[PDB]
Amino acid sequence: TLTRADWEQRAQNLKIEGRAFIQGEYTAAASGETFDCISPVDGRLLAKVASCDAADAQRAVESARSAFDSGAWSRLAPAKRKATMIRFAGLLEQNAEELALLETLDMGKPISDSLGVDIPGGARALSWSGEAIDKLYDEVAATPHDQLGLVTREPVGVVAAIVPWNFPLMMACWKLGPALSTGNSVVLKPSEKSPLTAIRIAQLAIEAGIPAGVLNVLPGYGHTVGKALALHMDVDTVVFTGSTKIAKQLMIYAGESNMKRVWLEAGGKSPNIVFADAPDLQAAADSAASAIAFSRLLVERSIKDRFLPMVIEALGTWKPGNPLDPATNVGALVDTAQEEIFGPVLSVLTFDTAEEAIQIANDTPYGLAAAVWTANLSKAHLTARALRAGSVWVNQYDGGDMTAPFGGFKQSGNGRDKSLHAFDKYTELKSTWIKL
Amino acid sequence: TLTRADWEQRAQNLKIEGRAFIQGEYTAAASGETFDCISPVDGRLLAKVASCDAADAQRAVESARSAFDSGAWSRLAPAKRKATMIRFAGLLEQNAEELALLETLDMGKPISDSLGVDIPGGARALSWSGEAIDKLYDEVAATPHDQLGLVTREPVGVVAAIVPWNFPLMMACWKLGPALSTGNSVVLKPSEKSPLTAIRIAQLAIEAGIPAGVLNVLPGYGHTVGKALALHMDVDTVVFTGSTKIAKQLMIYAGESNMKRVWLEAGGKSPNIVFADAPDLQAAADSAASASRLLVERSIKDRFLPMVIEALGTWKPGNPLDPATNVGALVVLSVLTFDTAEEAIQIANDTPYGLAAAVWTANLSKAHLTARALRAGSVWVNQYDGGDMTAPFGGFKQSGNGRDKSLHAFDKYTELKSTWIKL
Amino acid sequence: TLTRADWEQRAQNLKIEGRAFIQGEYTAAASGETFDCISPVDGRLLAKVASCDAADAQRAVESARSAFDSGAWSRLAPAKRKATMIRFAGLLEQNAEELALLETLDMGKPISDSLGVDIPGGARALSWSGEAIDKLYDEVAATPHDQLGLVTREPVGVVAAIVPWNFPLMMACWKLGPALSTGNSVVLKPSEKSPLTAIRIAQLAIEAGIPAGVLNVLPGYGHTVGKALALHMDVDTVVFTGSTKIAKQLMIYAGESNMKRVWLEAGGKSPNIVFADAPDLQAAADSAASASRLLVERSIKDRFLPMVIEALGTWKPGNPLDPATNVGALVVLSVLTFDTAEEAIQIANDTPYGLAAAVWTANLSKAHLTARALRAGSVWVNQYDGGDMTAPFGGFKQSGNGRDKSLHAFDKYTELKSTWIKL
Amino acid sequence: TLTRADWEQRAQNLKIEGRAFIQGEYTAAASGETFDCISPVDGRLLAKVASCDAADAQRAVESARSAFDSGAWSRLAPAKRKATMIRFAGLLEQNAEELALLETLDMGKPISDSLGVDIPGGARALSWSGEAIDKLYDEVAATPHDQLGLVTREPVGVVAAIVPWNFPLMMACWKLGPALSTGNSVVLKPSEKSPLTAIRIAQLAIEAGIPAGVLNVLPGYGHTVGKALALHMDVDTVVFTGSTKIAKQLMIYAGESNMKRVWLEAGGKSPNIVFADAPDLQAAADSAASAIAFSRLLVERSIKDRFLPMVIEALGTWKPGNPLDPATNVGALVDTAQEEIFGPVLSVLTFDTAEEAIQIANDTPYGLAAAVWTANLSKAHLTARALRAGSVWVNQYDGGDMTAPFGGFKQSGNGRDKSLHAFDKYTELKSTWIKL
């Protein structure tokens, strides 16, 4: 296992690619302009990264459209797209230490999380999506005997994927896995705060067998190249994760341009409901402490006095550190009777009944996730069912396989990352009704 | 079988309701204002219809939300929502002659179409969606043995349904069937050119057992009450059929308001692609004549175009109240030639739209490969305007997003939830 | 609401049909023989019922096969088979008082159960399966672009349905609903102890629009006409509910004849596992009393056993024609103690059978983990005899194979086909 | 590419395992008895193979039951069973040349078919089944609000898989893939004519991570150990491919013992319907010739004179040869107006209408497969639909991905190998109805 000094040496010895990627080749932005990618670990200059704009969006989309029309990927046999997507995931694992280090240097994530969670989780989304391709079935309708009615799914064509900086590679792979597996061409626009891993995997896709033009990567700013993609008249679908404010802007851009499909995932405050009969109060307390560090806590009154000190002590475990130290669990970054505030940073809502907890938890713009802690069978299922959240966790927190659609109710977003339902965002339904 | 004179007598003897419907009662608009519902058959004044605005949108949405939160419909057992939807459909059928006559007087559709197609088709959309409710299953994920992973569907809450004048009742039922069946409250906003059947069925829904506030109906103009629903901060989903220009405006209104989900069916074309080996050229000709772009293989064009010209002659405008009329009186077809299936596909797909297409060929490969290559939500092969309730209907590209009919229509009215339970 | 005297008057005034039904007509058995259908209520002779044998099996199967090959039902549009099945169910409901009375006279079931549970439950099985028909989709495989891969379901052809006397009509409808709805012809063989309702509904099927020959009914003995259907070389599938011993014999008969598919629901037990934290001990006690093995957690056993003894007293035998009767007059519960959920599971699973089980606990993990570990086709948690038409019913191990009710019941009556089309 | 001489040398240099495999170890039969596995290539003695009987069935089933009850495989997380099953497939590919050579020596299959079709096809069934495990979903019923209704699938427990000698490894993998992926323990009984590859992969399963006891292999005779498994009172399910006569016997054995589930796949004569408007008459003729060599031919009258000589010439291409020669396409083995017979070996039925063709093709005990050749859209779909066969091929022959359920109508069998439907044979449905 690598020490902090090993990672420091590896960091110094990286050669970091900063260019955009279009039609199988790294390329500067048409303007030649760049922005400084500055590490939050120690302020070092990681790379001068291409600052793409509308001219680059245009070239990336032309490349994407032409590749989609060629059929090189969009009409490739499903079992061969499966194999390619699994090789793609394998190349992420084969380059895991470099990718984890790029991620940590780019935006400060602890090297243990980059290497232990994000990069394997990104690989897993690519390979799971590939595995699923030829396990999917479309539909034959119940029709009279002189009719054959097919209901099939087809790729939308050109997909723009705009992702934030919190899980740069893993969020990108959650879009890329299903979007590529269904046969679309993808123009990926990583956050200006974390472009490096997206830039790096562009080349691994080619290595895996993804044809030129099928995955283009445009680093740069949201207000320049992101807006240009959202407004582009030949982009069929934009998928977005990020802030509610930008999510709303994309609907506006869609309406102002070509009525493209828009799928949104927008954070929102996620409640944590702890009942007095939770089976493992220490687990609930660890959960609550985790959410304050790298959420809205609701606690039953009969357990509040006992429970809050456990949250406080558990919070002590989270300590900033150098992200290059494997022991660090929080990145120490550098410049580039119902409601109470208990400590400096402990905000707590108290309830007496489950109905109170549900009404307070649902009193929100919503609503990406929620956790419920109770040993009682009826209260667990009825509370989970009453919460307006795309993900509800019961007696655990942040649980969820690749078999888990991740998304929100209302201003938290629309559509769902992950699962077989993830594919639906990237395909169109067609009805073929054949007279025999 | 009723004669024209029978229908003119029934038309004269109708009492026509014009009010909005909120929380189980017909009501004037808050302002007291109305607009004149004028028959394109006659010029006769059918009714003074409530001209709702933002204040009525507010009351309809508050009513819808409180009905949703009450669970009276949203948490009613699936089998009981099935029975109510089926009774609702039975009440359209039981009142079919009055509803077809309202439809024909309201916007000029021939009475034989209103009675024979639209009212039965709208009733069928309600009963079929009702029948489906308790046949749907959600999902149990494959998980480790100490986990239960459930992926379920839940109603979004309050649905605004905005529909045009071309198929007032049936297009409304295409929305209402799946939207109500999944437990939502619906605020229905019919076109200003055809509000009457939507107003009338609001009372039939109550008679069937739909609770007060679950189906509210707001007649009025698109730019007043329609805009106010698209912009409303407590409407979870808007579903729409109509023009591309308005469909785009709804996305903008959603972004300006609460990020509500927007499902659009916009304008589209139904091009016919007629190959020389079409099994029944007369059927292809009738299809082209019921209308726009006609793609014709060069070798049969000389023989085929006279067939469509003759068929175009069978459509005679007449009095919409005459059972013999097939086009209502009231108050250019482009020929492209091709030599290969590849050209026909490229020509057909050269469009911002993509709603439907019909393909005519007796060849196995050509039929399936051409249907695959067309960017249309519906492809009909060796027939036109085909499909029933099992066939989802909608558009690629700027013809909209989402699908009406089939089990997939339900998806637009529900939200996915993943519940991960540690055991 | 009818009184006992009302029911005794209706029982006296019935005219009871006793003939077999083949190709749209009631008929004597080929031999002319009958057996005496004696009421366990009274000893009264209800009817002299046709005693069919191998020759009648032959004629019923020839009729079924020719009806199947004609396509009159097997190739009728799914929506038309839906409407007929729903009308068929409506005819059971329209004749519910006569059918419940036949059921009660035939095998002694209390009239309030016959009228209140069995006839509605049988009708519901017919209408629910009918409603499902056109909501089912087959599959399009993921294939290269020059291939179309279809995986579809087709009716097996001729189905023999053999049912016992405990729920004559409803168990018959559990078979008929899915078997007819998928387009098969069915030869129904009711128990010799309860042939009357099956005989009677054969005419209702025709009245609903089921074609002649699609539903044939052969009363008689298991060892004559039943054996002859199990051994018949042109019966594609036999479905059965009854004893383990006969269920095993049917597999043998299938192997001795034409390798027909065999679907069995055999004997099973409904053990109750009552934990100390059960949310409602009285409900658990009533469950145990409606009866066999009772697993009880040691700490509540002293308090719980008096509750089941008291509840056992509420079951009083009486005249089956008395609406107040809950056990028909006509003509040992084993207590196991456990300390942990692991013992309770091991005790419960220590059985050759595995049809059903009920588990009583308010604990989330314990409920789900115990239900997972039980080898039973149905597990009820904090209720007993639960589930509706959406819940498949059947057994693990020697309680049989396959499931009645739910969309999965359809699988037993269809065959999969893969069609791989080169384009 | 290896020459015939390379294969001859490899054949001589093999060390061939002949023992049975129970509870993670090779073992002789309890009796110590063996039978001679004699190569049909040149009569050489390949190995003395354990001749298992009822005592061995009993020990294998006890091992299988105990392993299933332990949960080591049956309650292993689905994503981990996926990984193990994919490693299993990888070990087949890693040992492909040895496995292909064992198959060719064991029963005479051409070495090019063993190496090019059977071994990769067997690996593909194992890995596809593993890929599918965590893409499967059970069901949540539509219930009143105070009810949770689950409809789930569970492994049956102990599965006996009895396979013939025609595709010894590939047929075994068609059962093993889904049976193991769903978590059952499997007792595999290969044909007495081809036991070697089944014996050899038993060890590769352990290497892959399949726990001891989960896959036991019992070589020996049908009338001894096969019957003992079919009669065993603790086997939950027998799956069988082979002759109609033995298929019927297994139903009898099931009824005489414990009412175990029986799933059968029994050959039957498969028709080949050639219409005058077939798009590629040469392809249809190659198809018909292939079926006579390593079926029932139906030909439209208006094309018969033109078509039959193409069949005859195409049949000339199939020539027996030494199975160890890569050029060989047929193993040359050694001892261990409607109906016409045209040549020595060309039986042909002539029809005038599609209805005639359908009625003649369906006039059968059935009915495993069928092929239709016509360019006409309506006739293709309507004929395919009218045929009573588990597999219908249109304008091709023996087509079919792993996404293809393979099985028969009526005396051709019940249930279907391959596809997602393949899993249903190996699981039980349970309904859990929870009052809330």
From TrEMBL, chains A, D:
| A Pfam family it matches | Aldedh
Q: Does the keyword Ribonucleoprotein apply?
A: no
Q: Which residues form the active site?
A: 265
Report residues binding NADH 1. Answer: 163, 165, 189, 192, 243
The record's PROSITE patterns line, in alphabetical order, gives:
ALDEHYDE_DEHYDR_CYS (PS00070), ALDEHYDE_DEHYDR_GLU (PS00687)
Q: Which residues are in the Aldehyde dehydrogenase domain?
A: 28-431
* Name of the protein in question: Aldehyde dehydrogenase family protein
- Upper taxonomic classification of the species? Bacteria, Pseudomonadati, Pseudomonadota, Gammaproteobacteria, Pseudomonadales
